[PDB]
Design a protein around this ligand. Structure first.
Ligand SMILES: *[C@@H]1O[C@H](CO)[C@@H](O[C@@H]2O[C@H](CO)[C@@H](O[C@@H]3O[C@H](CO[C@H]4O[C@H](CO[C@H]5O[C@H](CO)[C@@H](O)[C@H](O)[C@@H]5O)[C@@H](O)[C@H](O[C@H]5O[C@H](CO)[C@@H](O)[C@H](O)[C@@H]5O)[C@@H]4O)[C@@H](O)[C@H](O[C@H]4O[C@H](CO)[C@@H](O)[C@H](O)[C@@H]4O)[C@@H]3O)[C@H](O)[C@H]2NC(C)=O)[C@H](O)[C@H]1NC(C)=O
Ligand SMILES: *[C@@H]1O[C@H](CO)[C@@H](O[C@@H]2O[C@H](CO)[C@@H](O[C@@H]3O[C@H](CO[C@H]4O[C@H](CO)[C@@H](O)[C@H](O)[C@@H]4O)[C@@H](O)[C@H](O)[C@@H]3O)[C@H](O)[C@H]2NC(C)=O)[C@H](O)[C@H]1NC(C)=O
Ligand SMILES: *[C@@H]1O[C@H](CO)[C@@H](O[C@@H]2O[C@H](CO)[C@@H](O[C@@H]3O[C@H](CO)[C@@H](O)[C@H](O)[C@@H]3O)[C@H](O)[C@H]2NC(C)=O)[C@H](O)[C@H]1NC(C)=O
Ligand SMILES: *[C@@H]1O[C@H](CO)[C@@H](O[C@@H]2O[C@H](CO)[C@@H](O)[C@H](O)[C@H]2NC(C)=O)[C@H](O)[C@H]1NC(C)=O
Ligand SMILES: *[C@@H]1O[C@H](CO)[C@@H](O[C@@H]2O[C@H](CO)[C@@H](O)[C@H](O)[C@H]2NC(C)=O)[C@H](O)[C@H]1NC(C)=O
Lengths: 218, 218, 196
């Protein structure tokens, strides 16, 4: 059982800059002067894509900015100029000794200029209220960096811990994030209060933007 | 072209056998070996076993007691059977073709999430996130209270793709999952263009298509 | 583009004499390796085999008399064969056989030992020249610019080499400078001379 150890575990790099990922093996992965280390790219939802086989050999249909080097126990994947779509997790893979083993993974992220989010609030459907629950949704669309607060206020009353958040991975084109926050109440509790509001905070915002709605209005 | 595809139940009760079947096209199993890799949620890749072209097999030693791999060349099918399962065995299961001699895994299946749980399957409820009232307008679908993962969401049967953000699911305190899918569009197109979201939940064999329409004063 | 690795493969391997030949096996991981066997069949000799069973950690040589033909190092690390310094006796077939779980794979080498000929050119008689390619292997090919009225000896030595001589006359006084064109695998060669 050879233990592959990638370095770093994640790196952030500006768009167009070089990006190097190391992978050191506990023992040699070579035989007859051929190194059996292979590199993979995996994006959310998808299986691993083979970039580089036996150490340095570039696969068909893979950009030539992807390159590979090394031997014995020390190997390196290099992306000469990082593009927006290259945001992924990258894995090394030995196939010299049974069992085949994989590296821990290296997350690659793009650094880019700040972008303020587009906030949208969505009131609950009549359908859902009929079934006796209210889900109020607040969408923060296309922003960088990732860090953003979202406070839920109901008649200017700070809500506490009856909501969940979720964040998309970095976009393959604009290299931004999106976030959705869902306030879940009962129909009973929903219909007591009038104003439902979503206070956002971000770097791109000079001060907190708030989107709100009144309950029996449009 | 070379293709691989995993079939499987999606939900499995603890201490029962997990059965999967990789089905392959573009190559014969007499010539090429095939391996199984898994990937527990938000964790790295782990090799399970190989079905050599000749007919023999190797198994990762940690799974060797529980795991069985077989195939049928005339069907172009490779079976996997993992007994005595637990929550640890919850993972995405890939099959992947090895090229001879080098053991490079060049082509992979899309994968199949298998969730080990004694809880029962439940289909999703879909609710609209209707666009408010411009310049740019956002709208979406709330896919609520389903088990297990995953859910797939498309828009206009895949005709609408750019602007879309399907968020990762969040486990609610009920124990059921819930996600949102949203898309940005022009405000001008809210009248003319129709927007249908296509939810699919393979574990329950549920499939929901729902037209998101602007809510009125009515 | 990538086609499947074929089972049997054969190649002509021309190599100069007194050099270090190295024959590679195809690329193979130790994981895929069961046995690896260099079979070496020289002309009119018993077949020498050099096996390496990986599982049992056994290296086994059979009927291998020439001690120049060996592993580059050790088959547990490196499955390449070498020939210490090449000689004319080493003309023959060299085959890497690889037992794997997937199957058996052969990369064969039809080894040809080259010998660089001693090439000369000299004025002989009244308007004649002689171009020799002495004791090369295989036979060299000789031609003239301009063409004359030439004759050619081939002399086939027992050690495997060949001497190719070419005497050539020019009666026509349109010729003064003559160029021998010796064609050989070790390297083509040209020699001008004024026909004084
Ligand atoms: C790649 O190249 C290789 C090498 O050239 C090639 O393999 C040869 O292919 C030819 C043509 O198909 C084969 O010819 C057949 O030979 C049959 C019997 O062969 C016996 O005799 C061989 C010679 O032995 C003498 O010489 C050696 C060396 O000097 C000496 O050591 C011996 O003591 C002996 O004096 C011998 O090499 C051969 O060995 C067998 O075992 C070894 C070890 O396991 C193995 O490596 C060999 O492959 C082989 O199995 C054997 O003992 C013969 O019966 C057969 O006859 C048919 O054809 C005739 C017409 O020609 C018909 O009339 C008849 O009815 C039969 O149908 C045929 O002549 C030759 O044997 C191969 N040699 C080797 C070394 O492999 C590959 O095919 C090439 N492949 C590609 C894809 O290019
Ligand atoms: C190393 O190379 C040696 C090269 O000769 C190999 O020896 C030869 O092996 C073959 C079998 O592969 C033998 O063939 C058999 O011989 C017996 C009896 O042999 C007697 O009669 C023959 C008549 O031709 C004579 O030449 C011999 O000297 C013997 O007096 C027969 O009953 C069989 O039918 C078959 O023909 C060769 O005889 C044998 N030759 C010699 C000189 O030993 C040897 O096998 C190689 N080593 C390994 C490990 O493979
Ligand atoms: C194979 O056999 C041939 C034929 O015997 C050998 O050719 C001969 O090689 C010798 C030694 O190299 C030559 O003699 C030398 O010639 C040079 C140049 O004139 C001279 O300076 C030396 O003092 C010496 O006399 C000889 O000319 C040559 N040719 C013939 C026809 O005999 C050949 O060397 C053998 N090759 C091998 C690899 O065994
Ligand atoms: C051949 O040698 C290797 C070591 O070079 C042996 O491999 C060990 O085998 C034992 C039991 O099979 C394992 O516990 C070890 O982990 C193996 N590896 C090492 C590095 O020790 C192998 O056993 C030998 N083959 C035979 C048939 O004895
Ligand atoms: C050495 O000389 C030979 C003979 O002149 C060259 O081989 C010829 O190459 C031409 C290339 O157009 C072919 O059309 C002929 O058929 C060849 N003739 C023979 C007899 O092979 C050869 O290219 C020269 N150079 C080298 C490096 O070998």
């Amino acid at each position: 059982d050879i233990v592959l150890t990638q370095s770093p575990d994640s790196l952030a790099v500006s768009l167009g800059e070089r990006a190097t990922i190391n992978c050191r093996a506990s023992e040699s992965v070579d035989y007859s002067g051929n190194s059996f280390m292979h590199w993979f790219q995996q994006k959310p939802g998808q299986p691993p894509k083979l970039l580089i086989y036996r150490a340095s050999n570039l696969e068909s249909g893979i950009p030539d900015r992807f390159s590979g080097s090394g031997s014995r126990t020390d190997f390196t994947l290099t992306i000469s100029s990082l593009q927006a779509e290259d945001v992924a997790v990258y894995y090394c893979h030995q196939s010299n000794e049974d069992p085949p083993t994989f590296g821990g993974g290296t997350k690659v992220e793009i650094k880019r200029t700040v972008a303020a989010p587009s906030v949208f609030i969505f009131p609950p459907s009549d359908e859902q209220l009929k079934s006796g629950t209210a889900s109020v949704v607040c969408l923060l669309n296309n922003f960088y960096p990732r860090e953003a607060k979202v406070q839920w206020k109901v008649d200017n009353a700070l809500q506490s811990g009856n909501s969940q958040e979720s964040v998309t991975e970095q976009d393959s084109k604009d290299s931004t994030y999106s976030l959705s926050s869902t306030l879940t109440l009962s129909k009973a509790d929903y219909e007591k209060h009038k104003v439902y509001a979503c206070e956002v905070t971000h770097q791109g915002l000079s001060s907190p933007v708030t989107k709100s709605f009144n309950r029996g209005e449009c | 072209e070379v293709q691989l595809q995993e079939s499987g139940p999606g939900l499995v009760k603890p201490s029962e056998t997990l059965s999967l079947t990789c089905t392959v096209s573009g190559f014969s199993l007499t010539n090429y070996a095939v391996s199984w890799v898994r990937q527990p949620p938000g964790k790295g890749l782990e090799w399970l076993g190989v079905m050599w072209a000749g007919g023999g097999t190797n198994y990762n030693s940690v799974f060797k007691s529980r795991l069985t791999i077989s195939k049928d060349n005339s069907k172009n099918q490779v079976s996997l059977k993992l007994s005595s399962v637990t929550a640890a065995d919850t993972a995405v299961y890939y099959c992947a073709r090895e090229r001879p001699l080098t053991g490079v895994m060049d082509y992979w299946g899309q994968g199949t999430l298998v969730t080990v749980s004694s809880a029962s399957t439940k289909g999703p409820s879909v609710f609209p996130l209707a666009p408010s009232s411009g310049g740019t307008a956002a709208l979406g679908c709330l896919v609520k209270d389903y088990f297990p993962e995953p859910v797939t969401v498309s828009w206009n049967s895949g005709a609408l793709t750019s602007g879309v953000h399907t968020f990762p699911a969040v486990l609610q305190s009920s124990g059921l999952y819930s996600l949102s899918s949203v898309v940005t569009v022009p405000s001008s197109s809210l009248g003319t263009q129709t927007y249908i979201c296509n939810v699919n939940h393979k574990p329950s064999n549920t499939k929901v298509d729902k037209k998101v329409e602007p809510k009125s004063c009515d | 583009n990538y086609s499947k690795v074929l089972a049997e493969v054969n190649t002509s391997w021309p190599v100069k004499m007194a050099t270090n030949a190295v024959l590679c096996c195809p690329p193979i991981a130790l994981r895929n390796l069961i046995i690896i066997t260099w079979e070496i069949i020289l002309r009119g000799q018993p077949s020498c085999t050099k096996a390496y069973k990986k599982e049992t950690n056994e290296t086994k040589e059979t009927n291998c008399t020439d001690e120049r033909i060996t592993w580059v190092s050790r088959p547990d690390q490196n499955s390449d064969l070498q020939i210490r310094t090449v000689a004319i006796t080493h003309d023959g077939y060299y085959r890497c056989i690889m037992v794997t779980p997937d199957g058996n794979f052969h990369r064969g080498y039809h080894l040809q030992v080259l010998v660089t000929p001693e090439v000369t050119l000299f004025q002989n008689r009244n308007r004649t020249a002689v171009c020799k390619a002495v004791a090369g292997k295989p036979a060299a090919h000789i031609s003239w610019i301009p063409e004359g009225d030439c004759a050619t000896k081939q002399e086939y030595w027992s050690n495997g080499t060949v001497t190719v001589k070419s005497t050539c006359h020019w009666e026509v006084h349109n010729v003064s400078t003559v160029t021998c064109h010796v064609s050989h695998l070790t390297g083509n060669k040209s020699l001008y001379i004024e026909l004084l």
